[PDB]
Amino acid sequence: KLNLTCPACKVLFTALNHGLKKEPNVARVGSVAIKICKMLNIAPLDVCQSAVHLFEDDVVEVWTRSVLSPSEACGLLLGSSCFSTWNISLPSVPKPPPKPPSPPAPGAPVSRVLFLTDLHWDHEYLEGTDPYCADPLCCRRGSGWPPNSQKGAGFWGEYSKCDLPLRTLESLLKGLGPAGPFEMVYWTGDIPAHDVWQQSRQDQLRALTTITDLVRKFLGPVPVYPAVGNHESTPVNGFPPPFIKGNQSSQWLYEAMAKAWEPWLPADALHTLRIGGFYALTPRPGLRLISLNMNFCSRENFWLLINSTDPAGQLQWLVEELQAAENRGDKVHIIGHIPPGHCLKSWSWNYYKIIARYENTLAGQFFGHTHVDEFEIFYDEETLSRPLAVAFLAPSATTFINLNPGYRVYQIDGNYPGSSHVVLDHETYILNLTQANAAGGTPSWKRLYRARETYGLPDAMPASWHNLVYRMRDDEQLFQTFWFLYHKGHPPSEPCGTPCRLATLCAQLSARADSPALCRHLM
Ligand SMILES: *[C@@H]1O[C@H](CO[C@@H]2O[C@@H](C)[C@@H](O)[C@@H](O)[C@@H]2O)[C@@H](O[C@@H]2O[C@H](CO)[C@@H](O[C@@H]3O[C@H](CO[C@H]4O[C@H](CO)[C@@H](O)[C@H](O)[C@@H]4O)[C@@H](O)[C@H](O[C@H]4O[C@H](CO)[C@@H](O)[C@H](O)[C@@H]4O)[C@@H]3O)[C@H](O)[C@H]2NC(C)=O)[C@H](O)[C@H]1NC(C)=O
Ligand SMILES: *[C@@H]1O[C@H](CO[C@@H]2O[C@@H](C)[C@@H](O)[C@@H](O)[C@@H]2O)[C@@H](O[C@@H]2O[C@H](CO)[C@@H](O)[C@H](O)[C@H]2NC(C)=O)[C@H](O)[C@H]1NC(C)=O
Ligand SMILES: *[C@@H]1O[C@H](CO)[C@@H](O[C@@H]2O[C@H](CO)[C@@H](O)[C@H](O)[C@H]2NC(C)=O)[C@H](O)[C@H]1NC(C)=O
Ligand SMILES: *[C@@H]1O[C@H](CO)[C@@H](O[C@@H]2O[C@H](CO)[C@@H](O)[C@H](O)[C@H]2NC(C)=O)[C@H](O)[C@H]1NC(C)=O
Ligand SMILES: *[C@@H]1O[C@H](CO)[C@@H](O[C@@H]2O[C@H](CO)[C@@H](O)[C@H](O)[C@H]2NC(C)=O)[C@H](O)[C@H]1NC(C)=O
Ligand SMILES: CCCCCCCCCC(N)(P(=O)(O)O)P(=O)(O)O
Ligand SMILES: [Zn+2]
Ligand SMILES: [Zn+2]
């Protein structure tokens, strides 16, 4: 026991964790925290110096606490004095024995799938403004001007906490020629910018109509299959389950999507889309595309306080779609915005259980939301050792934060009977702002890398990505590459030390939220 109250403990972790974000050592930061404790009379210094001694005696205990923040660490140290359970009904049909997808045979075609996510169009982006304003979003009207001649916001964007003007997005679509042709496109939400404090419903629908028409303009007859992001509504993250009716429901948003996305989605899809913002359709024989609204898994969605149990019956709906694909022989692609690893515990554990059951039917999982080049591996529930699926977390088109613009393209097993529809390889394209915003610089999108090439993989199967993680656990050079691509070729100046490495690698193995057992082989 420590004579340390709940708010008191939060002041220390604040002054420490904020300090540990760039300060070289713990000692100097430890002194600041003790001085804070003294100046404000927050607690007895013996207790304060005892807490600093524990918060990070070594980085290991804190390596587990890499996720932990003040409220999260205090609860564990103080106790209870400082989210419901539920699960899904799986059909009684016995699980087919696991068998890997057969590699494509000679002559089997390939298909290219463009993947767009996190475009975050800022209607108010303005060149020359201050990229480091006080607001959560800058490079826009109201952020001010730079101080004493410092460089303002770049023309095509900036490496800061800023989003993109329409110019950079129009430039992205126009230069897709070399990346295609595309059989279809996946678009996992987050269309508006991060100007939350001034997002009316008119603004959000303006971003939907404006970007939808733009995408449709440069893709033309190619179908685009979108998924609902967490910024698409106002207030942000607020997606009430369909049991809420009236002007406070998300119908203003869902009925606007069904109208804007009608060219791409069939009747049955729009039906569910209007109700809960999710749908399922058949884009080609043998394949079933399922678009999930991961806002109903979101931690920021305050609406789930009413009933966080499978909101909208989506997972139960997902199970039915998956089980029907299994009986039919089809394979499944799931698209969403928030990756399952970032979901609420119950929702995530149930999704993890669903993916484990239908491993032979699932051929691809695609998400975004992280804005960086990541991937989440799923393991068998019985032993948590056989990688059986992969969720590719594509990088954002926007710069938010301190990143290069970029999109993703997937090579999948082609459109033919018996195909596995699995991802065979993928590529990432970027816009190099340092060259585009420079005097005389012109937009030129280039292929950053191809996965199988840089990583030397035999394929894009779960076992290969599983083997790529532990190769990076022991190969500092192979991880730096991944770390370089992680940020779309614009890493932070802060090198990723051995605690950062294992933390990043632990994210690659944690497709289930709150499961430390998934990273037991990292130290
Ligand atoms: C956890 O910390 C608690 C707070 O710690 C303080 O806060 C930090 C920021 C620093 O300032 C640090 O130095 C402090 O210690 C701490 O709470 C303290 O606990 C002690 C005893 O456990 C309390 O002592 C008692 O105080 C009362 C009130 O004192 C004054 O008021 C009355 C009238 O209201 C007057 O009559 C008194 O003369 C005082 O002017 C006293 O009444 C009481 O004395 C009586 O009882 C004792 C024995 O019980 C007899 O010897 C006396 O003769 C009296 O009969 C105590 O002296 C202290 O008030 C309390 N302070 C605060 C701010 O809460 C706590 O002890 C720590 N907990 C643990 C588990 O360590
Ligand atoms: C909470 O909702 C669950 C989930 O069902 C959906 O929730 C609402 C949106 C509501 O409008 C229903 O029409 C939806 O179907 C309710 O039922 C649970 O359903 C899930 C599977 O989808 C299952 O895991 C649970 O065991 C079910 N529980 C029950 C009691 O049927 C449930 O009615 C709501 N529970 C609470 C406590 O609010
Ligand atoms: C959630 O948890 C368990 C899964 O192990 C389920 O317990 C079964 O409950 C159903 C009724 O819904 C019964 O048919 C089964 O007989 C129960 N268990 C066994 C071993 O028979 C539970 O039903 C699951 N489902 C839900 C909706 O929570
Ligand atoms: C429906 O709900 C909206 C949600 O905000 C109500 O609020 C108005 O609309 C915008 C967003 O669309 C808000 O930013 C404003 O605060 C509100 N309007 C104004 C002029 O400030 C809206 O009033 C509701 N609509 C109806 C018709 O009742
Ligand atoms: C984007 O373009 C910039 C500018 O051409 C590249 O930055 C250079 O990187 C080399 C690497 O050794 C440095 O020596 C130069 O000083 C950098 N130039 C500037 C102006 O900073 C950058 O490498 C390019 N990024 C990608 C992903 O292609
Ligand atoms: C250099 C690595 C850091 C990248 C920055 C990531 C920002 C994340 C944005 C959000 N997840 P999204 O909902 O906009 O996707 P948010 O929830 O923070 O808004
Ligand atoms: Zn985003
Ligand atoms: Zn998002």
Author numbering: 82 to 163, 169 to 609
Pull text from the paper:
Acid sphingomyelinase (ASMase, ASM, SMPD1) is an enzyme found in lysosomes and in the extracellular space where it catalyses the conversion of sphingomyelin, a major component of membranes, into ceramide and phosphocholine. ASMase consists of an N-terminal saposin domain and a C-terminal catalytic domain. To gain insight into the molecular mechanism of ASMase function and the interplay between its domains, we determined crystal structures of the full-length protein from mouse that reveal a conformational flexibility of the saposin domain. In one conformation, the saposin domain adopts a globular closed form independent of the catalytic domain, while in the other conformation, it assumes an open V-shaped fold that establishes an extended interface with the catalytic domain.
As observed with other saposins, ASMasesap adopts either a closed or open conformation depending on environmental conditions. In the closed form, ASMasesap is compact, globular and interacts mainly with the CTD, although this interaction appears to be a consequence of the crystal lattice since the two molecules in the asymmetric unit occupy slightly different positions, with the linker between the domains disordered in one molecule. To further these efforts, we determined the structure of ASMase bound to a known high-affinity inhibitor, 1-aminodecylidene bis-phosphonic acid (AbPA; half-maximal inhibitory concentration 20 nM)24. One phosphate group of AbPA completes the coordination shell for the zinc ions whereas its nine-carbon lipid tail sits in a relatively featureless shallow groove. This structure and the position of the leaving group-protonating His280 allowed us to propose a model for how sphingomyelin might bind to the active site. The fatty-acid chains of sphingomyelin sit along a hydrophobic track that extends from the edge of the active site to the saposin domain and surprisingly, do not correspond to the position of the AbPA lipid tail, which instead coincides with the position of the choline head group. These results will help direct the rational design of new ASMase inhibitors that better exploit the shape of the active site.
